[PDB]
Write an enzyme that holds these catalytic residues in place. Structure first.
Site, PDB file in Angstrom:
ATOM      1  N   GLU B  23       8.024  18.147 -20.603  1.00  0.00           N
ATOM      2  CA  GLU B  23       8.161  17.170 -21.684  1.00  0.00           C
ATOM      3  C   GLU B  23       8.020  17.823 -23.054  1.00  0.00           C
ATOM      4  OE1 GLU B  23       5.364  14.092 -20.678  1.00  0.00           O
ATOM      5  OE2 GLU B  23       6.545  13.392 -18.966  1.00  0.00           O
ATOM      6  N   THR B  28      15.281  17.185 -26.637  1.00  0.00           N
ATOM      7  CA  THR B  28      15.399  16.938 -28.066  1.00  0.00           C
ATOM      8  C   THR B  28      16.270  17.995 -28.734  1.00  0.00           C
ATOM      9  OG1 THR B  28      13.187  16.005 -27.936  1.00  0.00           O
ATOM     10  CG2 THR B  28      14.061  16.427 -30.124  1.00  0.00           C
ATOM     11  N   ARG B 152      11.981   9.110 -26.015  1.00  0.00           N
ATOM     12  CA  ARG B 152      11.484   9.836 -24.860  1.00  0.00           C
ATOM     13  C   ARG B 152      12.293   9.423 -23.639  1.00  0.00           C
ATOM     14  NH1 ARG B 152       9.539   9.849 -19.558  1.00  0.00           N
ATOM     15  NH2 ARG B 152       8.595  11.909 -19.190  1.00  0.00           N
ATOM     16  N   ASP B 174      20.046  21.820 -19.731  1.00  0.00           N
ATOM     17  CA  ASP B 174      18.692  21.292 -19.803  1.00  0.00           C
ATOM     18  C   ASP B 174      18.169  21.171 -18.384  1.00  0.00           C
ATOM     19  OD1 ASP B 174      16.223  20.223 -20.503  1.00  0.00           O
ATOM     20  OD2 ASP B 174      17.009  18.342 -21.265  1.00  0.00           O
ATOM     21  N   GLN B 178       8.809  19.578 -14.722  1.00  0.00           N
ATOM     22  CA  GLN B 178       7.738  19.132 -13.850  1.00  0.00           C
ATOM     23  C   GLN B 178       7.626  20.064 -12.652  1.00  0.00           C
ATOM     24  OE1 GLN B 178       5.813  16.738 -14.976  1.00  0.00           O
ATOM     25  NE2 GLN B 178       7.182  16.811 -16.751  1.00  0.00           N
TER      26      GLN B 178
HETATM   27  N1  LIG Z   1       6.769  14.797 -33.462  1.00  0.00           N
HETATM   28  C1  LIG Z   1       7.447  15.608 -32.657  1.00  0.00           C
HETATM   29  N2  LIG Z   1       7.917  15.146 -31.446  1.00  0.00           N
HETATM   30  C2  LIG Z   1       8.610  15.961 -30.619  1.00  0.00           C
HETATM   31  C3  LIG Z   1       8.851  17.271 -30.980  1.00  0.00           C
HETATM   32  N3  LIG Z   1       9.552  17.851 -29.983  1.00  0.00           N
HETATM   33  C4  LIG Z   1       9.757  16.941 -29.005  1.00  0.00           C
HETATM   34  N4  LIG Z   1       9.172  15.767 -29.385  1.00  0.00           N
HETATM   35  C5  LIG Z   1       9.165  14.510 -28.624  1.00  0.00           C
HETATM   36  O1  LIG Z   1       8.667  14.704 -27.321  1.00  0.00           O
HETATM   37  C6  LIG Z   1       9.376  13.901 -26.399  1.00  0.00           C
HETATM   38  C7  LIG Z   1       9.650  14.691 -25.137  1.00  0.00           C
HETATM   39  O2  LIG Z   1      10.631  15.640 -25.440  1.00  0.00           O
HETATM   40  P1  LIG Z   1      11.727  16.007 -24.337  1.00  0.00           P
HETATM   41  O3  LIG Z   1      12.933  16.476 -25.038  1.00  0.00           O
HETATM   42  O4  LIG Z   1      12.005  14.880 -23.430  1.00  0.00           O
HETATM   43  O5  LIG Z   1      11.011  17.213 -23.564  1.00  0.00           O
HETATM   44  P2  LIG Z   1      11.737  18.006 -22.377  1.00  0.00           P
HETATM   45  O6  LIG Z   1      11.074  19.309 -22.189  1.00  0.00           O
HETATM   46  O7  LIG Z   1      13.181  18.166 -22.639  1.00  0.00           O
HETATM   47  O8  LIG Z   1      11.452  17.106 -21.083  1.00  0.00           O
HETATM   48  P3  LIG Z   1      11.241  17.862 -19.686  1.00  0.00           P
HETATM   49  O9  LIG Z   1      12.521  18.617 -19.302  1.00  0.00           O
HETATM   50  O10 LIG Z   1      10.146  18.928 -19.828  1.00  0.00           O
HETATM   51  S1  LIG Z   1      10.796  16.748 -18.491  1.00  0.00           S
HETATM   52  C8  LIG Z   1      10.668  13.477 -27.068  1.00  0.00           C
HETATM   53  O11 LIG Z   1      10.707  12.078 -27.154  1.00  0.00           O
HETATM   54  C9  LIG Z   1      10.592  14.030 -28.468  1.00  0.00           C
HETATM   55  O12 LIG Z   1      10.870  13.008 -29.394  1.00  0.00           O
HETATM   56  C10 LIG Z   1       8.392  17.736 -32.203  1.00  0.00           C
HETATM   57  O13 LIG Z   1       8.587  18.900 -32.531  1.00  0.00           O
HETATM   58  N5  LIG Z   1       7.677  16.909 -33.036  1.00  0.00           N
HETATM   59 MG   LIG Z   2      13.524  17.446 -20.733  1.00  0.00          MG
END
Ligand SMILES: Nc1nc2c(ncn2[C@@H]2O[C@H](COP(=O)(O)OP(=O)(O)OP(O)(O)=S)[C@@H](O)[C@H]2O)c(=O)[nH]1
Ligand SMILES: [Mg+2]
Ligand SMILES: CNc1ccccc1C(=O)O[C@H]1[C@@H](O)[C@H](n2cnc3c(=O)[nH]c(N)nc32)O[C@@H]1COP(=O)(O)OP(=O)(O)OP(=O)(O)O
Ligand SMILES: C=C[C@@]1(C)CC(=O)[C@]2(O)[C@@]3(C)[C@@H](O)CCC(C)(C)[C@@H]3[C@H](O)[C@H](OC(C)=O)[C@@]2(C)O1
Ligand SMILES: [Mn+2]
Ligand SMILES: [Mn+2]
Lengths: 841, 341
Positions: B23, B28, B152, B174, B178
């Site tokens: 996450e 993003t 999210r 992507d 998990q």
């Molecule tokens: N404020 C803030 N929020 C962030 C930042 N980076 C990501 N987020 C928030 O965290 C949430 C999770 O990000 P996401 O893109 O779903 O992670 P992911 O790694 O791709 O998800 P996964 O593959 O590990 S399950 C998103 O809703 C995003 O808005 C950041 O740099 N600053």
């Molecule tokens: Mg992700």
């Protein structure tokens, strides 16, 4: 040897014929120049000269006619003998009418020069014959000169000109040998390369279909040519849709092959397999592999067919004709199930040892369970079969005994080594050259200028330094130091060959110009003698036959043409036309001649290079082809089959294990493009197990084949010798040690893997077994027996991460020093109960 | 034939593997790519971020053994409302529900709990959300691009993108982060061009949803060690992103969470002198980001043999210009490695 070297010049006949014909052109050139010198200039007092040269000319064009004839094969060297005897009668007959006042040493000696080397080059006489003919012609020609001061130097001219003659002779025919030998082995290894290319082509076309083969046929990616000899290994798999799958197997296979002598089971089983191969090749089929008693085919994965499923099911009806016609041939009580499914399959090859083109899908496993859900006599066909299957048959319910499935019933002589002889021989003849240049003085004791002794000094020192440098470069002492040879030949390339060749060539002419500066006709005997001297020593320049024709012939023209014409002009009355006319035939002679020899040398180098390359290509062909023979079948069954056609072998005691990767099904998930990345992981694992067997002490184990995700090997076959240091149960014990080893190897494979583990289980048995070969132009080495069924049912039911031991293996391994514990007595089909022991504690 | 031109354009592309912890912000970043260089579910999953958020806090109030009760207990029918819709996948979002989460958001146990939701599992982008839900009771105005970037979505399964930047080919993956999805990461180990790694910055006092027992930062160090010494990853240099800059910045402004009280490597630590600062910069921020930079780079010291490299850059997911700059620099470095051999 004898006959083949004879047939050489039987086919080197037309080129010796050719150069010999233009030697006759040189003979008519000679009679032409006698005709002009006795034609325009002088001797208009007796015309006796012209007629033997004219009949010598009708000898020229008349034997140009006689060159074509057929009473000629055992005649043409003797025809040269006739030719040179007419030469001998011509010159010896025309010599004597002298001593009247005028013709000097230069005239008759020049005649003898042209005669002698026209003999020793082209006329193609043998050793002995041209030898004693030249010598006898020499001595009687010089006593024709007579009728202890200068005649000694005449004999020095004659014996030196003989020695350089026999030198040219022997080098000429040894190139005539070695050129023929290189070309002959070049014409053997090409066709041997083609035939063994066809043999390798058979080995490719005995294990695999045509498509990936024809990718291996034209080096389209050199990753495969780099794969004959780090991130991920390369392998061919393609994920193809709309194919079909047919499985067939004998029901109740347990007791039916009991009383077989391991050739009768081969007889009926391979007879039915031969009829299987007949109906596959007649029904356009894709057979894969024999899994013990199960045989199976698919429907057109290289070539997707339009009515493919109908070919599959009527093909299986062909197998119904196989069981009815071969069963009622043999009058047996047997039957076979058939399960057929249409679906998608990713196909390809895994592994790198004993590999085989196989197929993968859960549609294949659907066909497996339809054989498991099968019934005799009719083909078991799925939903996906009958959803489009034209309904032209007898469809029935394939119902449960307890998934939407129907039934169908019907309706020597090296280069620098020769340069040793032309340099070393060139300086011993240079030795008697300058020796003769000084010890003509018997009426004197010393040459007047000291610069003659200076030319003697730097000339003899340069020739002796080239001598010692070359001879200690060649004969390989390696005592004091050899790096000056590398550092001085480091600047002696193919152009310093030209240049230092021009040095050692050009200096003896200055050494006969040791007598050139001051007076030379107080006595004219000095003058005629030094003219005969420089025209004698000028012939030396051909001995480097290994440099170019315009270059050496032009340089030879310069150093052998300057001060002769130019020193005629300062002042002994009338000699010029004859002396420099014979310089003219001298010069065109030496140009044409050494031109011919250097061309011959270049052709020898060509004819060595090409045979070398073809030898390399047959070496690579044997490594790659015999590498496939070491791939597909085992070694002493290649010793039995390699020169024959059959095989069948009893075996009495041997070891066999299975290895079972458990959780590959749960790891499989195919949400990606075929999911074949997972097969890249699996193929990296099986390749690591392949690398486990390349130990020398673990080259005593023989991998049988790969079966899905179940791994298989055996031993007790490589000990084909009654050795004095081979324990009767050693391969068993070290095979167990290898089993714990590969347990540690899969442990290390999950050590590289992340957040995940692969489980496995292994099973052991020793006992009697059967070594056999099945196929016909599409083969497979295989084993059988009850023992492999015991270890089979063992490791099929075996708990993971442990080592599964039989009670008799429990009886032997403890006395080879191994601890076990009693697990129980698990039900074994065919054995009732069988008492189970395990290794981990 | 046409195998050679298609196989050569197969050579000429730019595939990007995007691993990283759970996450983090990888999805993003892919959203940032499709805003830069490139229709009804947004209301749904944003409002389920809302629902799962507010019921995770409101349920999680009594779960805190330091007793966090309501400073406004007079909305107990709203408390029992959130306990009523606590486990239901279906909800219609009436304006009365907006009064429920509204009046909860009027209470201060929600706000200090938002200061203390890192003590358990809860989202990290709800301060956006409750203000927007205060505005977006109706959504006749379509929500913005920042609204797209805060959305999210749980990420699992291989998703691909092929967009182009100035005659530069982009095909990228992507991949979920998990634990159970980690069996799928070798599926994209097939000879990809570059590997870009992302760790959330503020994850030095929180845990993963698997065990709820061990810090996400040490999870990230374990993950970087497990990839960093592989016999399949030695030929790809890694570009190391450290996302969520500003959340770490406001936790510095909080001054309540200490890495050095947890990880005492930071305790006697000193600031690096090879720095390149930022305008108006607290040195504790600098010693923080350079500390964690040195923490991963310390793991990058242990191996490599000049084969696989380590390129520490920085980014946050709320700057267009940063993705612009360091991703153009990424295009430079992957141009070098794209023509390394
Ligand atoms: N404020 C803030 N929020 C962030 C930042 N980076 C990501 N987020 C928030 O965290 C949430 C999770 O990000 P996401 O893109 O779903 O992670 P992911 O790694 O791709 O998800 P996964 O593959 O590990 S399950 C998103 O809703 C995003 O808005 C950041 O740099 N600053
Ligand atoms: Mg992700
Ligand atoms: C006395 N034992 C034999 C002597 C000569 C040839 C074969 C055997 C023998 O033991 O055959 C058994 C297997 O080794 C032999 N065998 C079969 N498949 C394999 C196989 O896939 N690999 C190996 N190594 N051996 C196999 O088949 C027979 C059992 O097949 P299955 O258990 O798979 O069930 P089935 O195929 O339906 O036969 P049945 O139930 O109708 O009786
Ligand atoms: C190994 C992978 C996987 C999933 C792929 C597959 O299709 C199979 O290999 C077949 C059908 C397939 O390989 C045909 C041969 C054989 C040996 C009959 C297989 C086994 O039944 C495998 O199951 C077992 C018992 O290993 C199975 C199902 O396993
Ligand atoms: Mn059977
Ligand atoms: Mn079987």
């Amino acid at each position: 040897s004898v006959n083949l070297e004879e047939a050489c010049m039987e086919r080197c006949f037309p080129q010796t014929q050719r150069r010999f014909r233009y030697a006759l052109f040189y003979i008519g050139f000679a009679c032409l120049l006698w005709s002009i010198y006795f034609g325009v200039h002088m001797k208009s007092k007796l015309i006796v000269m012209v007629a033997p040269a004219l009949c010598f000319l009708v000898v020229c064009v008349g034997f140009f006619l006689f060159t074509f004839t057929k009473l000629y094969a055992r005649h043409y060297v003797w025809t040269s003998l006739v030719l040179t005897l007419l030469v001998f009668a011509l010159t010896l007959a025309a010599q004597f009418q002298v001593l009247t006042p005028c013709l000097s040493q230069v005239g008759s000696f020049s005649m003898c020069i042209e005669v002698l080397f026209l003999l020793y080059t082209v006329m193609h006489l043998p050793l002995y014959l041209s030898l004693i003919l030249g010598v006898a012609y020499s001595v009687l020609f010089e006593t024709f000169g007579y009728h202890h001061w200068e005649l000694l130097s005449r004999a020095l001219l004659h014996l030196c000109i003989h020695a350089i003659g026999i030198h040219l002779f022997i080098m000429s025919q040894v190139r005539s040998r070695s050129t023929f030998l290189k070309v002959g082995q070049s014409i053997m290894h090409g066709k041997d390369l083609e035939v063994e290319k066809a043999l390798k082509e058979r080995m490719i076309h005995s294990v695999m279909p045509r498509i990936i083969a024809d990718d291996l046929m034209k080096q389209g990616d050199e990753e495969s040519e780099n794969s004959v000899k780090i991130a991920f290994r390369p392998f061919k798999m393609q994920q193809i849709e709309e194919v079909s799958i047919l499985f067939a197997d004998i029901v109740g296979f347990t007791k039916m092959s009991a009383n077989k002598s391991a050739h009768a089971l081969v007889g009926l089983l391979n007879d039915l397999f031969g009829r299987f191969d007949r109906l596959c090749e007649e029904t356009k089929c894709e057979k894969i592999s024999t899994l013990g008693d199960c045989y199976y085919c698919v429907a057109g994965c290289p070539e997707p067919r339009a009515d493919h499923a109908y070919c599959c099911i009527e093909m299986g009806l062909g197998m119904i004709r196989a069981i009815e016609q071969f069963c009622q041939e043999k009058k047996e009580m047997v039957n076979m199930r058939v399960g057929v499914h249409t679906g998608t399959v990713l196909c390809g090859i895994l592994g790198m040892r004993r590999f085989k083109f196989d197929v993968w899908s859960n549609d294949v496993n659907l066909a497996n369970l339809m054989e498991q859900l099968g019934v005799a006599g009719k083909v078991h066909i799925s939903e996906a079969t009958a959803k489009y299957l034209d309904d032209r048959y007898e469809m029935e319910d394939g119902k449960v005994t307890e998934l939407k499935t129907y039934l169908i019933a019907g309706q020597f002589a090296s280069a620098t080594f020769s340069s040793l002889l032309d340099v070393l021989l060139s300086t011993t003849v240079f030795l008697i050259l300058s020796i003769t240049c000084f010890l003509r003085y018997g009426a004197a004791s010393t040459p007047p200028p000291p610069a003659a002794l200076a030319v003697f000094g730097a000339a003899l020192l340069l020739e002796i330094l080239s001598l010692v440098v070359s001879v200690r470069m060649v004969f390989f002492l390696e005592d004091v130091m050899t790096c000056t040879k590398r550092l001085l030949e480091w600047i002696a390339g193919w152009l310093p060959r030209h240049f230092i060749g021009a040095i050692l060539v050009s200096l003896p002419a200055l050494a006969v110009y040791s007598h050139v500066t001051s007076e030379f006709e107080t006595n004219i005997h000095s003058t005629m003698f030094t003219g005969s001297a420089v025209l004698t020593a000028v012939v030396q320049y051909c001995n480097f036959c290994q440099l170019s024709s315009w270059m050496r012939s032009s340089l030879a023209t310069v150093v052998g043409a300057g001060p002769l014409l130019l020193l005629l002009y300062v002042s002994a009355s009338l000699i010029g036309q004859e002396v420099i006319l014979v310089f003219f035939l001298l010069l065109l002679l030496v140009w044409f001649l050494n031109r011919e020899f250097e061309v011959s040398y270049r052709l020898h180098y060509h004819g060595d290079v090409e045979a070398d390359l073809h030898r390399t290509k047959i070496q690579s062909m044997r490594d790659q082809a015999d590498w496939l023979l070491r791939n597909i079948i085992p070694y002493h069954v290649a010793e039995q089959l390699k020169v024959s056609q059959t095989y069948s072998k009893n075996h009495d005691s041997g070891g066999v294990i299975f290895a079972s990767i458990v959780n590959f099904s749960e790891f499989y998930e195919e949400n990606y493009e075929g999911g074949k990345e997972c097969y890249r992981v699996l193929n990296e694992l099986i390749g690591d197990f392949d690398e486990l067997l390349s130990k020398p002490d673990y080259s005593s184990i023989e991998k049988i084949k790969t079966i899905g995700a179940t791994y298989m090997a055996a031993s007790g076959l490589n000990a084909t010798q009654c050795r004095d240091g081979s324990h009767p149960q050693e391969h068993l014990q070290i095979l167990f040690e290898f089993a714990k080893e590969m347990m540690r190897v899969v442990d290390d494979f999950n050590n590289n893997m992340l957040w995940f583990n692969f489980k496995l289980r292994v099973g052991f048995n020793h006992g009697p077994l059967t070594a056999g070969v099945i196929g016909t132009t599409k083969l497979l080495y295989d084993i059988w027996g009850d023992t492999v069924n015991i270890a089979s049912r063992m490791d099929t039911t075996g708990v993971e991460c442990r080592i599964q031991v039989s009670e008799e293996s429990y009886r032997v391994l403890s006395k080879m020093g191994y601890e076990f514990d009693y697990r129980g007595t698990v039900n074994v089909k065919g054995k009732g109960q069988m008492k189970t022991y395990l290794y981990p504690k | 034939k046409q195998l050679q031109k298609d196989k050569q354009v197969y050579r000429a592309t730019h595939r990007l593997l995007l691993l990283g912890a759970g996450e983090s912000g990888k999805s993003t970043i892919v959203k940032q790519m499709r805003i830069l260089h490139v229709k009804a579910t947004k209301v749904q999953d944003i409002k389920n971020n809302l629902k799962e958020a507010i019921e995770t806090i409101v349920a999680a109030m009594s779960n805190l053994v330091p007793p966090v009760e309501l400073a406004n207990p007079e909305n107990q029918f709203r408390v029992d409302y959130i306990l009523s819709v606590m486990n239901v996948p279906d909800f219609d979002f009436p304006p009365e529900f907006y009064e429920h989460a509204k009046a909860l958001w009027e209470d201060e146990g929600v706000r200090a709990c938002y200061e203390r939701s890192n003590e358990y599992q809860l989202i990290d982008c709800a301060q956006y959300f409750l203000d927007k839900i205060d505005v977006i009771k109706q959504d006749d105005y379509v929500p913005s691009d920042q609204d797209l970037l805060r959305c999210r979505v749980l990420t699992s399964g291989i998703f691909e993108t092929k967009f182009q930047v100035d005659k530069v080919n982009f095909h990228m993956f992507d991949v979920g982060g998990q634990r159970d999805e980690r069996r799928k990461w070798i599926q994209c180990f097939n000879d990809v061009t570059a590997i870009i790694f992302v760790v959330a910055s503020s994850s030095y006092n929180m845990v993963i949803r698997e065990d709820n027992q061990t810090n996400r930062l040490q999870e990230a160090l374990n993950l970087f060690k497990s990839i960093w010494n592989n016999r399949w990853l030695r030929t790809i240099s890694v570009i190391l992103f450290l996302n969520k800059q500003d959340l770490l910045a406001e936790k510095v402004l909080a001054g309540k969470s200490k890495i050095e009280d947890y990880f005492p490597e930071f305790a006697r630590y000193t600031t690096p002198e090879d720095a390149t600062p930022e305008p108006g910069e607290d040195p504790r921020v600098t010693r923080a980001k350079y500390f964690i930079r040195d923490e991963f780079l310390r793991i990058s010291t242990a191996s490599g043999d000049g084969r696989h490299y380590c390129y520490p850059h920085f980014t946050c997911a709320v700057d267009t210009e940063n993705i612009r700059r360091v991703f153009n620099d990424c295009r430079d470095i992957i141009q070098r490695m794209h023509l390394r051999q």
